[PDB]
């Protein structure tokens, strides 16, 4: 069984760093097979990709948030963290962390398993 859990402050004062940590019990992050994305969903809106991180550190963020976000991934304890800097009043959303079998290119980007979904209100 593979599943991810998100942890972090569910309520933070706007206008500073917001830290979330998604930890996966299942497929290892170190394995060069899966990309770890950080899809977000604001209330009354659709999904919104933020960024992804690979085992070798070739991360890529959304062009909209290429400056305000930083995704790190540590494999010793097998988790990955998202730091959203200078969060505004529009960042109140559910921050999902998803798995993509893009590595191992049998199939293109395809989010199959999703985390529980932690709602952060700022």
């Amino acid at each position: 069984q593979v599943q991810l859990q998100e942890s972090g402050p569910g309520l933070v004062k706007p206008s500073e760093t917001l830290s979330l940590t998604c930890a996966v019990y299942g497929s290892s992050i170190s394995g060069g097979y899966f990309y770890w994305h950080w899809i977000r969903q604001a209330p009354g809106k659709g999904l919104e990709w933020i960024g992804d991180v690979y085992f070798s550190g070739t991360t890529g963020y959304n062009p909209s948030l290429k400056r305000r976000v930083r995704i790190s991934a540590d494999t010793s304890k097998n988790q990955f963290s998202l730091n959203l800097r200078s969060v505004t009043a529009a960042d109140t959303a559910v921050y999902f962390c998803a798995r993509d079998p893009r590595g191992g290119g049998w199939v293109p980007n395809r989010f199959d398993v999703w985390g529980a979904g932690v709602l952060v209100t700022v």
């Binding site: 290892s28 170190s30 060069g32 494999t75 590595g103 191992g104 290119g105 049998w106």
Partner: protein
């Protein structure tokens, strides 16, 4: 912290798995019970050194992705690149050409020897 994803790309395609060779390449080295442990260490060292000697004989010393000038005879395999790197995995490829391995190694050896001889002849001038 050197294990860190050993055989992680086993199920990946050859093209995708070829980008993580260093992960699998760095783990090849690391009273009677001490004898057995030391014998296991010596066996691992001998295997690694035979591997390195075989790589060096082909001129690929110190390279993880080294590609040579020996032509690929179609008799060994008829599958094209599109059906190999994007449609097949490394285990299936190894099982497919398991019986055409020694001749390829020999061809690489003589090709490297001929290349060295030609380089010496050219550089003599």
């Amino acid at each position: 912290a050197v294990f860190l994803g050993f055989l992680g790309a086993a199920g990946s395609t050859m093209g995708a798995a070829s980008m993580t060779l260093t992960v699998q390449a760095r783990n090849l080295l690391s009273t009677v019970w001490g004898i057995k442990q030391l014998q296991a260490r010596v066996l691992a060292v001998e295997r690694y050194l035979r591997d390195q000697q075989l790589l060096g004989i082909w001129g690929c010393s110190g390279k993880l992705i080294c590609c040579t000038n020996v032509p690929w005879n179609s008799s060994w395999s008829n599958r094209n690149l599109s059906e190999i790197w994007d449609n097949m995995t490394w285990l299936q490829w190894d099982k497919e050409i398991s019986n055409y391995t020694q001749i390829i190694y020999g061809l690489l050896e003589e090709s490297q020897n001929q290349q060295e001889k030609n380089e010496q002849d050219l550089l003599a001038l």
